[PDB]
Amino acid sequence: ATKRYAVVTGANKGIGFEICKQLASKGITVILASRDEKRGIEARERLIKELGSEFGDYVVSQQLDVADPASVAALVDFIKTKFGSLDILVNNAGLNGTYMEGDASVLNDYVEAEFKTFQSGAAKTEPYHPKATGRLVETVEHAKECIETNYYGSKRVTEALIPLLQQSDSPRIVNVSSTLSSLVFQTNEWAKGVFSSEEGLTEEKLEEVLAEFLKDFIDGKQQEKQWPPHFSAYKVSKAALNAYTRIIAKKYPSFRINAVCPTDAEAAEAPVKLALLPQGGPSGCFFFRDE
């Protein structure tokens, strides 16, 4: 009933776009934030034409690069000067740390090998490239950008919007994570130890794991030190984001703050429900689709 305002980052396509669609249709006013201005503008255009001209006021595009303090800073001023309030933050902007060399479809063989780690719990530490048709590349620079967006970007956007969110009588923060965040994949036992702590976990300790991983990664010691052979930066940053979700969950008890692993409209249903979470929903939990 009460008019609400939401930001969804990385929302010009994919699941984010569907999150935006579903929030706007429930009467929420959505800020569609995207790394590129025109794609965000075009995404807004398609949503109102799909939803109806009566939603033109309920969807707004604003450019947002989460790795860029000035982009983040510009967005807070925009929400401040146009609306004055914020009730929902959905952190969906994210990077893989990976690309495919050669046949792009071999990626499904790499992803397949990872999900069989779920049904055996035996996390292999030696790299195994399923085909010579394609190769899953994980460069040093992509690992920095991946960590910088998935961890530091989300924290930067979250901390910048907390002051506005705290004037909500129901602030909701939703962090879009990934199944690869599961600790079954953390072959490095120290890092797994840090991430698993429920008491005495600090952001400084999280940042030490990220910095330590990036340094063994520079040094070419990914395998020496038992770091994941594939999706390595991706797994560590999204696992870090899960742990960070719990940290700020405990800091702000009046908020409901959660992470969720997510066609795209159905996968968007789980994060959208958490953005409209009743005041009694949990806080600090990792949901796979539906719990």
Numbering used by the authors: 11 to 272, 287 to 315
Study text:
Three salutaridine/menthone reductase like subfamilies of short‐chain dehydrogenases/reductases (SDRs)2 from Mentha piperita were identified, namely (−)‐menthone:(−)‐menthol reductase (MMR), (−)‐menthone:(+)‐neomenthol reductase (MNMR), and isopiperitenone reductase (IPR).1a,1b MMR and MNMR catalyze the ketoreduction of (−)‐menthone 1 a to (1R,2S,5R)‐menthol 2 a and (1S,2S,5R)‐neomenthol 2 b, respectively.1a Additionally, they act on isomenthone 1 b to produce (1R,2R,5R)‐neoisomenthol 2 c and (1R,2S,5S)‐isomenthol 2 d, respectively. Interestingly, the three Mentha SDRs have high protein‐sequence identities (63–68 %), so we performed comparative studies of MMR, MNMR, and IPR, to pinpoint the determinants of ketoreductase vs. ene‐reductase activity within SDRs. A key difference in the sequences between the ketoreductases and IPR was a substitution of the highly conserved catalytic Tyr residue for Glu (238 in IPR). We determined crystal structures of both MNMR and IPR, the latter in combination with NADP+, alkene 3 a, and β‐cyclocitral (non‐substrate).
The MNMR structure was solved by molecular replacement using IPR as the search model (resolution 2.3–2.7 Å), and was found to be structurally similar (rmsd 0.97 Å). Major structural differences were not observed between apoprotein and NADP+‐bound forms. Therefore the bulkier MNMR Tyr 244 likely positions substrates in a different conformation compared to that observed for 3 a in IPR because of the larger side‐chain bulk of tyrosine. This is consistent with the helix of the flap domain (MNMR) being shifted compared to that in IPR, to accommodate binding of 1 a,b. KGaABiotransformations with MMR and MNMR showed only ketoreduction products, with no detectable double bond reduction.1a,1b Reactions with 1 a and 1 b generated the menthol isomers 2 a–d (entries 7, 8, 10, and 11).
